[PDB]
Amino acid sequence: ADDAKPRVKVPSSAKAGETVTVKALISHKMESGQRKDADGKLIPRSIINRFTCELNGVNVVDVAIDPAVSTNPYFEFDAKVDAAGEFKFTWYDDDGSVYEDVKPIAVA
Amino acid sequence: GSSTVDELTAAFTGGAATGEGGLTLTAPEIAENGNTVPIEVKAPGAVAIMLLAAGNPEPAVATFNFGPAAADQRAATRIRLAQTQDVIALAKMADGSVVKAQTTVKVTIGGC
Domain harbouring A14, CATH code: 2.60.40.10
In A, which residues are within 8 Å of B68 by CB distance? 58-59
Phi, psi of B4 (to 5 degrees): -60, -40
DSSP 8-state class, residue A47: -
Specified resolution (Å): 1.4
Domain definitions of chain B by residue range: 1-112
Q: Residue B49: helix, strand or coil by DSSP?
A: strand
Task: Give a three-class secondary structure readout of A67-97.
Answer: CCECCCCEEEEEEEECCCEEEEEEEEECCCC
Q: Which CATH superfamily is domain B1-112 in?
A: SoxY domain (2.60.40.2470)
Best residue of B4, B51, B79, B80 to probe chain A, by most A CBs closer than 10 Å? B80
Residue numbers of the domain that contains A108: 1-108
B9 within 8 A of B92, measured Cβ to Cβ: no
Q: Quick check: A77 and B74 CB within 8 A?
A: yes
Cβ of A8: how many Cβ atoms within 10 Å?
16
